[model samples]
Structures are given as C-alpha cells and as structure tokens.
Target: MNIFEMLRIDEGLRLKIYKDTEGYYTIGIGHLLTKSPSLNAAKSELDKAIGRNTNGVITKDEAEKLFNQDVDAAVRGILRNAKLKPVYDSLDAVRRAALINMVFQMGETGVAGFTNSLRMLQQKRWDEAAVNLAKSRWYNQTPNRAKRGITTFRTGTWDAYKNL
Candidate 1:
C-alpha cells in the first residue's frame, strides 16, 4: 500500500495545522515543524490566503518521504529498548504493529514507563493490559486512539472501534 494511505489510517486527513505529539504544531501528514511559531505562522498565513480551515497542501511524495523517515526514526528509538525485545518479538504482526504505533508516538523510553501495562503484556494478560492502558495519560489525551489500542492489544485486531 502507498505510505501516504498508510499514514492517513492513523494521522487522519488533516488539510490544516493541528497539534501533534507533545503539542507541537504539525501539518500535512505528520510533518512536525522545528519551531512551534513557524507552524503557527504557517497556519495563520494559510488562513489569510484561503480563509481559515481550508486548502493546506502537501504532495504525495512529500508525505511518503516524511512517513518513511518518521517510521525509521521511531523504529530505531524502539530498538534501543532492549528490555522489551522478548515481549515485543513474541507478538504477531498485528499486535506488534499496534505496539509499534504507540512506540512511534511515545518513544521507547516513554512506553517503558508503562510498567504495569508492560508486565501484563509480558504475562499475556491482554485484558488486564488493555485496562491498564485505559488508565493512562495516553488514554486520557487520545481516547479514541486509546480505544483502538486497548482492543488491538487485547485481540490483535485492527477493526476494534464499534458504536463509540
């Protein structure tokens, strides 16, 4: 599948500035900016150019390159957490993908902080781990995403959202 589509499955189709991980401003498919004000200014300029909330743009090649770079960097960060090797490697692809996505957002060091949840995951206590995940700052910050993570962790299924 195209990396752009793959990214959209998670980042959604935002055609304008939105706050990203740690509240830094981002735009056009997960492209985090160097300075927050640069992004803020960019958003403001867009509003002046084409009215607010409309017509922010990035090309397919641009988004794909960004995603590839980001995924690579995140994977490298995760690989540094050697303590999670066994637990991470034991899961099937779907489970691994779900966890990798989390690691992408939080970094390996951040995920490492989820002690109780990690312990339950190590024990294959899927439900308990999912519940533990639900009781997290990550859960509170991104409830819809946390719902997806909870179900994915428990069942290894991507089709987790239902009647929310």
Candidate 2:
C-alpha cells in the first residue's frame, strides 16, 4: 500500500500528522512530539503514534528529538494561511492541503511556479498541475516523491502528505 492507503486518512487528516508534529523536535525524518531529550525515546514515540495497530491500544508520544523547532514551525506557518487558498479551494481538500504542505516545506516563491497550474485548476484543469508539478526543479530534485503528490492533485485520489 502507498502512504495514502496505509494511513486510511481523509481530507481532515491529510497533512495534519494526527499529532501536529509541527512544533515538535526533529531528529530525522520525523518530528518528536515531546520534550524527551533522549534520542532513542523520541524515535520510539514517533513510530508508535504514526504506526498504530488499528486498535489504538498503545499510545506513543514524541520521537527523534528535534534540533530546530523552526523548521517544522516554518512549514506549518506557511500552511497556516497559504496565499493560494483561493486556488486551493478549487481543489479536493486532500490535494489542496497536500499542495500547501509541499510548498510549505519548499517555500511559496517555489509555489509561484504553480500559478499557471493553479489557474488551470481554477478552470478545472486537472491535468495541468500534475504536469507542471512534474516540470519543476523540486520535481527534478525529488521526482518519485513529487510525482506522487502531484498525481494526487491531478487524479483526486492522491492524499496523505506525511510529516510524522
């Protein structure tokens, strides 16, 4: 299963991280949600919060102590009120938030590349964003990952932008 299938998340859950690891500590790929300074403890907590057993029997907090709170916060800060909301509103909530999440990490000037893409979307041009997102330096830098996100925006099924 892809990340989307694994999480079984919908619009309300797409980039929310279930725990909003935004202000958390980041030791690596994931942000640790607590103040536990122990590196090992932080990683363990994040894994559990993200990977559940379908029963929620076990609860885990914080994983991988964050080195810079700003990175995560900056990401959220950007998404808090994406200037693209108007363009975003024209999309499936999943795609809308995922795009914001991607641009949040990548930056808004980075988002301007999607202007024509957004216009196309406003015009209900599904294939435009997909193609434009692929035609980016960001895409050139992370083809597989970017394509997956762009695919969701284009097809209306690409959801689950993870940061946990």
Candidate 3:
C-alpha cells in the first residue's frame, strides 16, 4: 500500500496536503505547482527542517532533503519512543512503512503533535485511533489533498510518498 493510499489521497492529481495543530493549511506537494514552490512552513520552520546544515537555502533538490529527513526521523522516532511502539506493534512492515510515508510528508513533530490520535493510541483503541488519525491537522486542509487523504486515512488506503 502506498502512503497516499493509506492516507487515502487521490493519485491522479499528485498533491501533498497537510494541516497544522489548529487544522490550518500548512503546505502542498504535487502537480499543484508548476514551479517547485517552497514547502508550506514558517521561515523559521523551513530554516530548521530544510535549511539548517545548508544555511537555510532550499531548492528542488535541497528541499527534497526534508522528505528524506522526515522519513529517517519518523522511523527512528517510532523505534525509540516507547509511546509510539504500541500503535505500530500490530502493524505489518508495509503498514509501518506507510506511516513513515505520512511522517515524511507531515514530519516527525507534526505526526507527534497528533493530540487526539496519540490519546487514542495510549488507550489502545484501534478504531478510534484510525479515525483520530484522519482528523489530524494533515487531513482535510488542501482542497484536493484533503478530499483524497482524509478518505485514504479513514479507510486504510495508500499511495507512494514521492507520487504524492
């Protein structure tokens, strides 16, 4: 299952839709922009997430670094964090990979900031956990991405991370 499918985003258009804690639009990735627009983030955040070692300069190639960084950090965070272990405990490797894809798009802190879903996980409520995950700020923010990702997330769907 691809990340977009697991997140239930539509594959046809190619988009990255994410929400903030307050459920505001953060950024988009996909065919949405003809020129590579900077990933949606505060300059401070961009500096931290995508710039840092590069002195805050981001380009198509350099910016792609963020996705890789998120993926590595996300997987490592899951492996090291006791709180995250249970939610992934029952997941197959594919499912775990899928979550990592979402993390790549949403980032470690973004996924970690999932207040409702984290609570559901703490309670070991799988169904509620899934639902709360969709309600994440990442869910229905971008017009097109929201329509697709929210559906995928709700239904255990997926699409490739790069494709999104």
| Most lDDT-accurate candidate | 1
lDDT of 3 by residue, 1-164 (tens): 54434432432221233444344433322211112234434434545554364333445554344434544566787777665666667555555655565555555666667767766655556577667766644656544554443333444444323365
TM-score of each: 0.75, 0.51, 0.46
Candidate 1, residue 123: how far the Cα is off, in Å: 1.4
- Score candidate 1 by lDDT: 0.68
Steric clash count of candidate 3 = 16
List clash counts for every candidate, in order. 0, 8, 16
- Which digits, one per residue and each the tens of the lDDT, describe model 1 over residues 5-100? 334566764545677856776665665643445665766654553333544565555555566777777666766687666667777776777777
Residue runs of model 3 more than 4 Å from their true location after superposition: 1-57, 101-128, 134-164
In model 3, how large is the Cα lDDT of residue 154?
A: 41
Error of 3 at 76 (Å): 1.3
Write down the lDDT of every candidate, Cα atoms only.
Answer: 0.68, 0.50, 0.49
* Model 2, residue 111: C-alpha shift (Å): 1.8
RMSD of each: 5.8, 9.9, 7.7
